[PDB]
Amino acid sequence: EDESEALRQARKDAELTASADSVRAYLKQIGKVALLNAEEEVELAKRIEAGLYATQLMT
Amino acid sequence: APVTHIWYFKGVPSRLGYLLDLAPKDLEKIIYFAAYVITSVDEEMRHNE
């Protein structure tokens, strides 16, 4: 079913495929990062604000 | 960025594969960004460490 080595390495092997079509390979790779919500967006925006502030301070 | 000439990578004999001792199935994965290779290793830096 899903556990007991039937589906985990199944997913790993299915993902680890040749993907001859270039668009297919790109869509396979893009299916790796989870989507984001508003709180994550504002938190990452705060992190980027801190990063650019630190870059300005370095300058 | 450098690219590979298809006439030499792809063919009935894969000339690049013959010279580098690989396979075209083990070259398309690299010159089309699907798997990495180890360009060089430090032998002594690993033997002592």
Side-chain angles (χ1 to χ4, degrees), chain A residues 20, chain B residues 4-11 13-18 23-29 31-32:
Chain B
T4 83
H5 208 286
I6 182 147
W7 268 14
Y8 304 75
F9 148 67
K10 205 133 207 305
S14 294
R15 270 76 160 202
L16 197 150
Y18 262 126
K25 147 206 151 286
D26 288 357
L27 277 178
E28 143 166 90
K29 296 230 179 287
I31 65 184
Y32 295 91

Side-chain angles (χ1 to χ4, degrees), chain B residues 1-11 13-49:
Chain B
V3 296
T4 83
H5 208 286
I6 182 147
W7 268 14
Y8 304 75
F9 148 67
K10 205 133 207 305
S14 294
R15 270 76 160 202
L16 197 150
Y18 262 126
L19 158 75
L20 271 193
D21 189 23
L22 290 164
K25 147 206 151 286
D26 288 357
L27 277 178
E28 143 166 90
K29 296 230 179 287
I30 296 94
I31 65 184
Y32 295 91
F33 300 98
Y36 292 68
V37 309
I38 304 319
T39 89
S40 81
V41 290
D42 302 335
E43 279 314 280
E44 184 271 312
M45 297 325 202
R46 185 193 68 260
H47 177 37
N48 62 355
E49 201 57 307

Side-chain angles (χ1 to χ4, degrees), chain A residues 6 8-9 15-16 30 32-34 39-40 44 49 53-54:
Chain A
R8 318 164 306 97
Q9 43 77 57
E15 175 84 351
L16 228 55
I30 198 56
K32 285 282 214 49
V33 184
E39 49 91 18
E40 201 78 28
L44 293 180
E49 180 57 272
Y53 184 21

Side-chain angles (χ1 to χ4, degrees), chain A residues 37-53:
Chain A
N37 39 357
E39 49 91 18
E40 201 78 28
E41 287 166 15
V42 304
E43 159 263 326
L44 293 180
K46 259 104 71 174
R47 279 175 60 162
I48 295 154
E49 180 57 272
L52 74 98
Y53 184 21

